[PDB]
Protein backbone atom coordinates (compact mmCIF):
# COMPACT_ATOMS: atom_id res chain seq x y z
CA UNK A 1 0.00 0.00 0.00
CA UNK A 2 1.32 3.76 -0.43
CA UNK A 3 0.24 6.86 1.09
CA UNK A 4 -1.28 8.36 -2.29
CA UNK A 5 -1.28 10.95 -4.49
CA UNK A 6 -2.42 14.73 -5.01
CA UNK A 7 -5.16 16.08 -7.06
CA UNK A 8 -8.76 16.42 -5.64
CA UNK A 9 -9.61 16.18 -2.26
CA UNK A 10 -13.11 15.39 -3.45
CA UNK A 11 -14.72 12.14 -1.40
CA UNK A 12 -17.93 10.74 -1.07
CA UNK A 13 -19.98 10.44 1.48
CA UNK A 14 -23.29 9.13 1.93
CA UNK A 15 -25.87 8.45 5.45
CA UNK A 16 -26.99 11.48 6.00
CA UNK A 17 -29.33 12.16 8.98
CA UNK A 18 -32.19 14.48 7.61
CA UNK A 19 -31.73 16.71 10.51
CA UNK A 20 -28.62 17.77 9.57
CA UNK A 21 -28.35 21.17 8.07
CA UNK A 22 -26.08 22.01 5.16
CA UNK A 23 -24.47 24.23 7.77
CA UNK A 24 -24.02 21.50 10.33
CA UNK A 25 -22.10 19.66 7.59
CA UNK A 26 -19.84 22.57 6.57
CA UNK A 27 -18.55 22.48 10.21
CA UNK A 28 -18.36 18.74 11.10
CA UNK A 29 -15.52 18.63 7.63
CA UNK A 30 -14.67 21.81 8.08
CA UNK A 31 -12.90 20.99 11.53
CA UNK A 32 -10.40 18.96 9.36
CA UNK A 33 -9.48 22.23 6.83
CA UNK A 34 -10.97 24.65 4.77
CA UNK A 35 -13.26 22.98 1.90
CA UNK A 36 -13.49 23.83 -1.40
CA UNK A 37 -17.06 23.21 -1.77
CA UNK A 38 -19.80 21.73 -0.58
CA UNK A 39 -22.62 19.71 -2.30
CA UNK A 40 -26.40 19.38 -0.38
CA UNK A 41 -28.83 17.68 -2.37
CA UNK A 42 -32.29 18.53 -1.01
CA UNK A 43 -35.80 16.94 -2.38
CA UNK A 44 -38.24 20.20 -3.97
CA UNK A 45 -41.27 18.41 -2.47
CA UNK A 46 -40.13 17.24 0.73
CA UNK A 47 -37.58 19.86 1.27
CA UNK A 48 -34.94 17.48 3.07
CA UNK A 49 -31.92 15.38 1.87
CA UNK A 50 -31.39 11.82 0.27
CA UNK A 51 -28.76 10.97 3.19
CA UNK A 52 -26.24 11.70 1.21
CA UNK A 53 -23.55 14.82 0.38
CA UNK A 54 -20.05 15.53 -1.98
CA UNK A 55 -17.51 17.02 0.34
CA UNK A 56 -14.27 18.91 -1.83
CA UNK A 57 -11.00 19.31 0.44
CA UNK A 58 -8.87 22.14 -1.21
CA UNK A 59 -5.95 19.89 0.19
CA UNK A 60 -5.57 16.27 -0.18
CA UNK A 61 -3.50 15.93 3.03
CA UNK A 62 -6.53 16.83 4.73
CA UNK A 63 -9.01 14.69 3.16
CA UNK A 64 -7.61 11.94 4.18
CA UNK A 65 -7.35 12.75 7.70
CA UNK A 66 -11.22 12.86 7.24
CA UNK A 67 -11.24 10.08 4.91
CA UNK A 68 -9.39 8.26 8.14
CA UNK A 69 -11.49 9.63 10.60
CA UNK A 70 -15.24 10.19 9.19
CA UNK A 71 -15.73 6.96 7.61
CA UNK A 72 -16.76 5.62 10.31
CA UNK A 73 -18.10 7.46 12.74
CA UNK A 74 -21.60 8.57 14.12
CA UNK A 75 -23.49 12.00 13.82
CA UNK A 76 -27.48 12.42 14.56
CA UNK A 77 -27.78 9.08 14.95
CA UNK A 78 -26.32 8.14 11.85
CA UNK A 79 -23.28 6.73 10.82
CA UNK A 80 -21.36 8.43 8.42
CA UNK A 81 -19.81 6.60 5.41
CA UNK A 82 -16.61 8.41 3.29
CA UNK A 83 -14.84 6.63 0.15
CA UNK A 84 -12.56 8.06 -1.96
CA UNK A 85 -13.50 9.03 -5.02
CA UNK A 86 -11.86 10.51 -8.19
CA UNK A 87 -13.22 12.80 -11.08
CA UNK A 88 -13.88 10.53 -13.99
CA UNK A 89 -13.69 12.75 -16.07
CA UNK A 90 -11.21 15.10 -18.46
CA UNK A 91 -12.31 18.30 -16.84
CA UNK A 92 -9.02 19.14 -15.11
CA UNK A 93 -6.43 20.18 -17.63
CA UNK A 94 -3.75 19.96 -15.12
CA UNK A 95 -2.56 20.10 -11.14
CA UNK A 96 0.24 22.66 -10.91
CA UNK A 97 1.81 23.63 -7.41
CA UNK A 98 2.49 26.68 -5.99
CA UNK A 99 4.94 27.62 -3.04
Given at each position: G?????????????????????????????????????????????????????????????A????????????????????????????????????
Amino acid sequence: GSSGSSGSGRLFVRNLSYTSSEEDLEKLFSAYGPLSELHYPIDSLTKKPKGFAFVTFMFPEHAVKAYAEVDGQVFQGRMLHVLPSTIKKEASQSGPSSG
